[model samples]
Target chain A: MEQRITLKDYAMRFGQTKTAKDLGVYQSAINKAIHAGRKIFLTINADGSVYAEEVKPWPSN
Target chain B: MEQRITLKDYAMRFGQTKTAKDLGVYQSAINKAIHAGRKIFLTINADGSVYAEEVKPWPSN
Candidate 1:
Protein backbone atom coordinates (compact mmCIF):
# COMPACT_ATOMS: atom_id res chain seq x y z
CA MET A 1 0.00 0.00 0.00
CA GLU A 2 1.11 3.55 -0.71
CA GLN A 3 1.15 6.37 1.77
CA ARG A 4 -2.39 7.44 2.70
CA ILE A 5 -3.55 11.03 2.90
CA THR A 6 -7.19 11.84 3.62
CA LEU A 7 -9.56 14.79 3.17
CA LYS A 8 -9.01 15.87 6.73
CA ASP A 9 -5.31 15.42 6.28
CA TYR A 10 -5.53 17.59 3.20
CA ALA A 11 -7.61 20.12 5.11
CA MET A 12 -5.11 20.29 7.92
CA ARG A 13 -2.19 20.44 5.56
CA PHE A 14 -3.78 22.97 3.19
CA GLY A 15 -5.66 24.97 5.81
CA GLN A 16 -5.02 24.35 9.47
CA THR A 17 -7.98 26.42 10.66
CA LYS A 18 -10.49 26.30 7.81
CA THR A 19 -13.41 23.93 8.06
CA ALA A 20 -14.15 21.18 5.50
CA LYS A 21 -16.69 23.49 3.83
CA ASP A 22 -13.96 26.03 3.16
CA LEU A 23 -12.20 23.59 0.88
CA GLY A 24 -14.26 23.17 -2.30
CA VAL A 25 -12.44 20.00 -3.41
CA TYR A 26 -13.12 18.20 -0.10
CA GLN A 27 -16.05 16.21 -1.45
CA SER A 28 -15.36 14.89 -4.93
CA ALA A 29 -11.59 14.65 -4.61
CA ILE A 30 -11.97 12.83 -1.31
CA ASN A 31 -14.40 10.36 -2.80
CA LYS A 32 -12.21 9.82 -5.80
CA ALA A 33 -9.07 9.33 -3.69
CA ILE A 34 -10.78 6.95 -1.30
CA HIS A 35 -12.13 4.77 -4.07
CA ALA A 36 -9.12 4.99 -6.37
CA GLY A 37 -6.61 2.78 -4.62
CA ARG A 38 -6.28 -0.47 -2.63
CA LYS A 39 -6.33 1.06 0.84
CA ILE A 40 -8.17 -1.05 3.37
CA PHE A 41 -9.31 1.31 6.12
CA LEU A 42 -10.31 4.94 6.55
CA THR A 43 -9.67 6.06 10.10
CA ILE A 44 -11.81 8.84 11.56
CA ASN A 45 -10.40 10.92 14.41
CA ALA A 46 -12.20 12.88 17.16
CA ASP A 47 -11.49 16.16 15.37
CA GLY A 48 -13.53 14.98 12.34
CA SER A 49 -10.19 14.23 10.65
CA VAL A 50 -10.04 11.17 8.40
CA TYR A 51 -7.09 9.13 7.15
CA ALA A 52 -6.93 6.05 4.95
CA GLU A 53 -4.55 3.30 6.02
CA GLU A 54 -2.15 1.36 3.82
CA VAL A 55 -2.98 -2.23 4.70
CA LYS A 56 -0.65 -4.20 2.43
CA PRO A 57 2.70 -4.95 4.02
CA TRP A 58 5.78 -3.58 2.21
CA PRO A 59 9.39 -4.71 2.63
CA SER A 60 10.80 -1.18 2.79
CA ASN A 61 11.63 0.08 6.28
CA MET B 1 14.91 13.45 -31.71
CA GLU B 2 11.71 11.49 -31.99
CA GLN B 3 10.47 9.82 -35.18
CA ARG B 4 8.54 12.12 -37.52
CA ILE B 5 5.28 11.56 -39.42
CA THR B 6 4.09 14.24 -41.81
CA LEU B 7 0.72 15.55 -42.99
CA LYS B 8 1.10 14.02 -46.45
CA ASP B 9 2.20 10.72 -45.01
CA TYR B 10 -0.81 10.78 -42.74
CA ALA B 11 -2.91 11.76 -45.78
CA MET B 12 -1.65 8.87 -47.89
CA ARG B 13 -1.84 6.49 -44.94
CA PHE B 14 -5.27 7.69 -43.88
CA GLY B 15 -6.79 8.85 -47.20
CA GLN B 16 -5.38 8.31 -50.67
CA THR B 17 -7.09 10.72 -53.09
CA LYS B 18 -8.38 13.59 -50.96
CA THR B 19 -6.69 16.98 -51.30
CA ALA B 20 -5.31 18.86 -48.28
CA LYS B 21 -8.43 21.10 -48.36
CA ASP B 22 -10.62 18.01 -48.18
CA LEU B 23 -8.67 16.74 -45.19
CA GLY B 24 -10.12 18.78 -42.30
CA VAL B 25 -7.12 18.41 -39.97
CA TYR B 26 -4.44 19.40 -42.54
CA GLN B 27 -3.84 22.89 -41.18
CA SER B 28 -3.72 23.04 -37.40
CA ALA B 29 -2.45 19.51 -36.78
CA ILE B 30 0.38 19.94 -39.31
CA ASN B 31 1.36 23.28 -37.83
CA LYS B 32 1.39 21.76 -34.38
CA ALA B 33 3.49 18.82 -35.53
CA ILE B 34 6.04 21.01 -37.32
CA HIS B 35 6.51 23.28 -34.31
CA ALA B 36 6.43 20.50 -31.71
CA GLY B 37 9.99 19.40 -31.01
CA ARG B 38 13.62 18.70 -32.01
CA LYS B 39 13.01 17.80 -35.69
CA ILE B 40 15.72 19.43 -37.83
CA PHE B 41 14.36 19.21 -41.37
CA LEU B 42 11.10 18.96 -43.33
CA THR B 43 11.47 17.13 -46.63
CA ILE B 44 9.01 17.88 -49.43
CA ASN B 45 8.63 15.04 -51.91
CA ALA B 46 7.83 15.28 -55.62
CA ASP B 47 4.16 14.51 -55.08
CA GLY B 48 3.70 17.41 -52.59
CA SER B 49 4.15 14.80 -49.86
CA VAL B 50 6.09 16.13 -46.88
CA TYR B 51 8.08 14.34 -44.18
CA ALA B 52 10.04 15.71 -41.23
CA GLU B 53 13.20 13.97 -40.06
CA GLU B 54 14.45 13.54 -36.51
CA VAL B 55 17.70 15.45 -35.97
CA LYS B 56 19.11 14.81 -32.48
CA PRO B 57 20.60 11.40 -31.78
CA TRP B 58 18.72 8.98 -29.60
CA PRO B 59 19.90 5.72 -27.96
CA SER B 60 16.94 3.72 -29.25
CA ASN B 61 18.63 2.77 -32.55
Candidate 2:
Protein backbone atom coordinates (compact mmCIF):
# COMPACT_ATOMS: atom_id res chain seq x y z
CA MET A 1 0.00 0.00 0.00
CA GLU A 2 2.55 2.53 -1.02
CA GLN A 3 2.17 4.67 -4.12
CA ARG A 4 2.56 8.39 -3.47
CA ILE A 5 3.72 11.59 -5.26
CA THR A 6 6.34 14.37 -5.32
CA LEU A 7 6.99 17.89 -4.01
CA LYS A 8 4.83 19.18 -6.84
CA ASP A 9 1.89 17.11 -5.65
CA TYR A 10 2.76 17.99 -2.08
CA ALA A 11 2.78 21.64 -3.04
CA MET A 12 -0.70 21.18 -4.47
CA ARG A 13 -1.46 19.10 -1.38
CA PHE A 14 -0.94 22.13 0.78
CA GLY A 15 -1.35 25.82 -0.01
CA GLN A 16 1.12 28.74 -0.22
CA THR A 17 2.79 28.18 3.15
CA LYS A 18 4.05 24.69 2.55
CA THR A 19 4.67 25.64 -1.04
CA ALA A 20 6.71 28.51 0.33
CA LYS A 21 8.64 26.07 2.53
CA ASP A 22 9.65 23.89 -0.41
CA LEU A 23 9.43 26.68 -2.91
CA GLY A 24 10.81 29.58 -0.90
CA VAL A 25 13.64 30.37 -3.28
CA TYR A 26 10.99 29.15 -5.52
CA GLN A 27 8.75 27.98 -8.35
CA SER A 28 5.19 28.50 -9.67
CA ALA A 29 3.97 25.86 -7.20
CA ILE A 30 2.50 28.50 -4.91
CA ASN A 31 0.40 30.15 -7.60
CA LYS A 32 -0.58 26.83 -9.10
CA ALA A 33 -2.00 25.57 -5.82
CA ILE A 34 -4.09 28.68 -5.34
CA HIS A 35 -5.55 28.41 -8.81
CA ALA A 36 -6.38 24.83 -7.94
CA GLY A 37 -7.75 24.88 -4.35
CA ARG A 38 -7.28 23.77 -0.70
CA LYS A 39 -3.76 22.72 0.22
CA ILE A 40 -2.08 20.41 2.81
CA PHE A 41 -0.98 20.87 6.41
CA LEU A 42 2.24 21.49 8.34
CA THR A 43 3.38 20.80 11.87
CA ILE A 44 6.04 22.52 13.96
CA ASN A 45 8.14 20.02 15.84
CA ALA A 46 9.54 20.45 19.36
CA ASP A 47 12.80 21.62 17.84
CA GLY A 48 11.09 24.26 15.72
CA SER A 49 11.50 22.16 12.62
CA VAL A 50 8.69 22.04 10.07
CA TYR A 51 6.97 18.74 9.41
CA ALA A 52 4.66 18.09 6.46
CA GLU A 53 1.62 15.90 6.92
CA GLU A 54 -2.14 15.82 6.30
CA VAL A 55 -1.59 15.62 2.57
CA LYS A 56 -5.24 15.52 1.51
CA PRO A 57 -6.81 15.75 -1.94
CA TRP A 58 -8.93 18.74 -2.82
CA PRO A 59 -12.70 18.40 -2.89
CA SER A 60 -13.53 19.24 -6.46
CA ASN A 61 -16.27 21.75 -7.28
CA MET B 1 -26.03 41.49 2.81
CA GLU B 2 -22.33 42.22 2.57
CA GLN B 3 -19.87 41.20 5.25
CA ARG B 4 -16.56 40.96 3.49
CA ILE B 5 -12.96 40.91 4.78
CA THR B 6 -9.38 41.87 3.96
CA LEU B 7 -6.42 40.60 1.92
CA LYS B 8 -5.05 38.87 5.02
CA ASP B 9 -8.28 36.92 5.25
CA TYR B 10 -8.24 36.55 1.48
CA ALA B 11 -4.64 35.32 1.62
CA MET B 12 -5.63 32.69 4.16
CA ARG B 13 -8.70 32.51 2.01
CA PHE B 14 -6.49 31.24 -0.77
CA GLY B 15 -3.22 29.33 -0.34
CA GLN B 16 0.42 29.70 -1.39
CA THR B 17 -0.49 30.97 -4.82
CA LYS B 18 -2.40 33.97 -3.59
CA THR B 19 -0.06 34.37 -0.67
CA ALA B 20 2.58 34.55 -3.33
CA LYS B 21 0.46 37.04 -5.23
CA ASP B 22 0.02 39.41 -2.25
CA LEU B 23 3.35 38.50 -0.74
CA GLY B 24 5.79 38.34 -3.61
CA VAL B 25 8.49 40.16 -1.64
CA TYR B 26 6.51 39.02 1.35
CA GLN B 27 5.42 38.17 4.88
CA SER B 28 4.51 35.17 7.11
CA ALA B 29 1.03 34.82 5.53
CA ILE B 30 1.96 31.80 3.46
CA ASN B 31 2.93 29.60 6.40
CA LYS B 32 0.04 30.76 8.52
CA ALA B 33 -2.53 29.62 5.94
CA ILE B 34 -0.99 26.15 5.55
CA HIS B 35 -0.94 25.65 9.34
CA ALA B 36 -4.50 26.96 9.46
CA GLY B 37 -6.29 24.76 6.87
CA ARG B 38 -7.79 24.71 3.38
CA LYS B 39 -7.49 28.17 1.84
CA ILE B 40 -9.82 29.47 -0.93
CA PHE B 41 -10.85 29.34 -4.54
CA LEU B 42 -9.21 31.11 -7.47
CA THR B 43 -10.45 31.76 -10.95
CA ILE B 44 -8.58 32.51 -14.13
CA ASN B 45 -10.92 34.99 -15.68
CA ALA B 46 -10.94 35.67 -19.39
CA ASP B 47 -8.22 38.10 -18.43
CA GLY B 48 -7.06 36.06 -15.40
CA SER B 49 -7.87 36.71 -11.75
CA VAL B 50 -8.46 35.08 -8.30
CA TYR B 51 -11.26 34.21 -5.87
CA ALA B 52 -12.05 32.84 -2.37
CA GLU B 53 -14.79 30.86 -0.55
CA GLU B 54 -15.84 28.41 2.22
CA VAL B 55 -18.24 25.57 3.18
CA LYS B 56 -20.73 24.74 5.92
CA PRO B 57 -19.28 22.44 8.56
CA TRP B 58 -20.66 18.99 8.88
CA PRO B 59 -20.61 16.55 11.81
CA SER B 60 -18.26 13.72 11.11
CA ASN B 61 -15.11 11.81 12.14
Candidate 3:
Protein backbone atom coordinates (compact mmCIF):
# COMPACT_ATOMS: atom_id res chain seq x y z
CA MET A 1 0.00 0.00 0.00
CA GLU A 2 1.08 3.65 -0.54
CA GLN A 3 0.73 6.75 1.55
CA ARG A 4 -1.57 9.44 0.20
CA ILE A 5 -1.50 13.21 0.60
CA THR A 6 -3.02 16.20 -1.13
CA LEU A 7 -0.95 17.80 -3.88
CA LYS A 8 -1.09 21.15 -2.12
CA ASP A 9 0.03 19.54 1.10
CA TYR A 10 2.81 17.83 -0.73
CA ALA A 11 3.79 21.15 -2.22
CA MET A 12 3.92 22.78 1.18
CA ARG A 13 5.77 19.80 2.57
CA PHE A 14 8.14 19.75 -0.34
CA GLY A 15 8.94 22.83 -2.45
CA GLN A 16 6.59 24.77 -4.68
CA THR A 17 8.90 24.53 -7.67
CA LYS A 18 9.52 20.85 -6.99
CA THR A 19 5.81 20.25 -6.79
CA ALA A 20 5.21 22.09 -10.05
CA LYS A 21 8.05 20.07 -11.48
CA ASP A 22 6.38 16.93 -10.18
CA LEU A 23 3.12 17.73 -11.97
CA GLY A 24 5.24 18.62 -14.98
CA VAL A 25 3.30 18.43 -18.27
CA TYR A 26 6.40 18.00 -20.41
CA GLN A 27 8.50 14.92 -21.05
CA SER A 28 11.85 16.67 -20.59
CA ALA A 29 10.51 18.18 -17.38
CA ILE A 30 9.41 14.78 -16.12
CA ASN A 31 12.77 13.21 -16.99
CA LYS A 32 14.48 14.95 -14.08
CA ALA A 33 12.12 13.37 -11.54
CA ILE A 34 12.48 9.84 -12.92
CA HIS A 35 15.44 8.40 -11.10
CA ALA A 36 16.58 6.30 -8.10
CA GLY A 37 13.33 4.28 -8.46
CA ARG A 38 11.69 6.89 -6.24
CA LYS A 39 9.11 8.30 -8.62
CA ILE A 40 6.30 10.63 -7.65
CA PHE A 41 2.75 9.27 -7.92
CA LEU A 42 -0.40 11.33 -8.28
CA THR A 43 -4.16 10.93 -8.75
CA ILE A 44 -6.92 13.50 -9.35
CA ASN A 45 -9.63 14.28 -6.85
CA ALA A 46 -13.38 14.77 -7.20
CA ASP A 47 -12.97 18.39 -6.10
CA GLY A 48 -10.66 18.99 -9.02
CA SER A 49 -7.34 18.69 -7.24
CA VAL A 50 -4.41 16.31 -7.20
CA TYR A 51 -3.00 13.90 -4.64
CA ALA A 52 0.63 12.99 -4.38
CA GLU A 53 1.77 9.58 -3.19
CA GLU A 54 5.02 7.88 -2.31
CA VAL A 55 5.99 4.58 -3.95
CA LYS A 56 8.33 1.96 -2.53
CA PRO A 57 11.33 -0.07 -3.76
CA TRP A 58 13.80 2.76 -4.17
CA PRO A 59 17.00 2.36 -6.13
CA SER A 60 20.09 1.18 -4.27
CA ASN A 61 22.97 3.47 -3.44
CA MET B 1 13.36 23.67 -33.72
CA GLU B 2 10.40 21.49 -32.70
CA GLN B 3 6.79 21.73 -33.72
CA ARG B 4 4.58 23.61 -31.28
CA ILE B 5 0.94 22.90 -30.43
CA THR B 6 -1.44 23.73 -27.64
CA LEU B 7 -2.27 20.93 -25.21
CA LYS B 8 -5.93 21.48 -25.89
CA ASP B 9 -5.41 21.39 -29.63
CA TYR B 10 -3.34 18.24 -29.36
CA ALA B 11 -6.04 16.60 -27.30
CA MET B 12 -8.69 17.74 -29.78
CA ARG B 13 -6.62 16.42 -32.65
CA PHE B 14 -5.81 13.22 -30.81
CA GLY B 15 -8.18 11.09 -28.77
CA GLN B 16 -9.59 12.51 -25.57
CA THR B 17 -8.69 9.37 -23.63
CA LYS B 18 -5.26 9.30 -25.22
CA THR B 19 -4.77 12.95 -24.32
CA ALA B 20 -5.77 12.22 -20.76
CA LYS B 21 -3.33 9.34 -20.80
CA ASP B 22 -0.73 11.68 -22.21
CA LEU B 23 -1.27 14.13 -19.35
CA GLY B 24 -1.03 11.19 -16.99
CA VAL B 25 0.36 12.34 -13.61
CA TYR B 26 1.83 9.09 -12.34
CA GLN B 27 5.14 7.52 -13.19
CA SER B 28 3.63 4.22 -14.26
CA ALA B 29 1.40 6.20 -16.62
CA ILE B 30 4.34 8.11 -18.04
CA ASN B 31 6.27 4.84 -18.52
CA LYS B 32 3.89 3.78 -21.28
CA ALA B 33 4.41 7.02 -23.24
CA ILE B 34 8.18 6.68 -23.10
CA HIS B 35 8.51 4.37 -26.02
CA ALA B 36 9.14 4.29 -29.77
CA GLY B 37 10.18 7.40 -31.73
CA ARG B 38 7.56 9.77 -30.35
CA LYS B 39 6.49 11.36 -27.08
CA ILE B 40 4.14 14.07 -25.88
CA PHE B 41 5.46 17.52 -24.96
CA LEU B 42 3.74 20.23 -22.94
CA THR B 43 4.13 23.68 -21.40
CA ILE B 44 1.77 25.75 -19.30
CA ASN B 45 0.13 28.91 -20.58
CA ALA B 46 -0.12 32.32 -18.97
CA ASP B 47 -3.87 31.87 -18.75
CA GLY B 48 -3.34 28.57 -16.90
CA SER B 49 -3.59 25.93 -19.61
CA VAL B 50 -1.05 23.45 -20.84
CA TYR B 51 0.68 23.51 -24.23
CA ALA B 52 1.90 20.36 -25.92
CA GLU B 53 4.77 20.40 -28.39
CA GLU B 54 6.47 17.92 -30.70
CA VAL B 55 10.15 17.06 -30.21
CA LYS B 56 12.37 15.36 -32.76
CA PRO B 57 15.19 12.78 -32.59
CA TRP B 58 12.97 9.84 -31.78
CA PRO B 59 14.03 6.36 -30.72
CA SER B 60 14.94 3.57 -33.11
CA ASN B 61 12.24 1.98 -35.25
> In TM-score terms, which candidate is top?
2
For residues A6-49, what per-residue lDDT tens digits would candidate 3 score against the true structure? 34334445666766765665444333554333446565443545
- Candidate ordering by DockQ (highest first): 2, 3, 1
> lDDT tens digits, residues A1-61, model 2?
1112233444554655765764353556556654665443444333545543434436645
What is the DockQ score, from 0 to 1, of model 3? 0.02
lDDT of each: 0.42, 0.44, 0.47
TM-score of chain B of each: 0.30, 0.36, 0.36
* Model 3 stretches astray by more than 4 angstroms: A1-31, A35-37, A57-61, B1-61
Question: Fnat of the models, one by one?
Answer: 0.00, 0.00, 0.00
Q: List the residue pairs that clash in candidate 2.
A: A13-A40, A14-A39, A14-A40, A15-B16, A16-B15, A16-B16, A17-B30, A30-B17, B13-B40
Query: Candidate 3 docking category?
Result: incorrect
Scored by Cα lDDT, where does model 3 land? 0.47
Q: What is the overall TM-score of model 3 with all chains considered together? A: 0.24
lDDT of 1 by residue, A6-53 (tens): 344344444533433443335555445545754434343435554444
TM-score of each predicted structure versus truth: 0.21, 0.26, 0.24
Instruction: Compose the digit string of candidate 1's lDDT tens values, residues B1-61.
Output: 1122334433444443343444434555544554564343443343555444445546556
Q: Candidate 1, what DockQ?
A: 0.01
Query: What TM-score against the true chain A does chain A of each candidate get?
Result: 0.30, 0.37, 0.38
Candidate 1 residue-wise lDDT at B35 = 51
User: Of 1 and 2, which scores higher on TM-score?
Assistant: 2
Off by over 4 Å in 2: A1-61, B1-18, B22-26, B57-61
